[PDB]
């Protein structure tokens, strides 16, 4: 699946891996993820973020 970088940052959300400890399971596409979800690191928007 893909991966989307912060660009404030630099985390990497992998879709494959999820973000389980802020709710989101493995396997959850980006642009399934909740409006006010927000990187785990910087704290900033998904508007932010750019796919690899
Ligand atoms: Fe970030």
Redesign the pocket.
């Known amino acids: 699946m893909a991966k989307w970088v912060?660009k404030?940052?630099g985390?990497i959300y992998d879709e494959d891996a999820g973000d389980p400890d802020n709710g989101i399971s493995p396997g959850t596409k980006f642009e399934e993820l909740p409006d006010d979800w927000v990187?785990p690191?910087?704290g900033?928007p998904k508007s932010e973020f750019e796919k690899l």
Do not use: S, T, V
Request: aromatic content about 12%; charged content about 0%.
């Open positions: 912060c404030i940052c985390y990187c690191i910087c900033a």
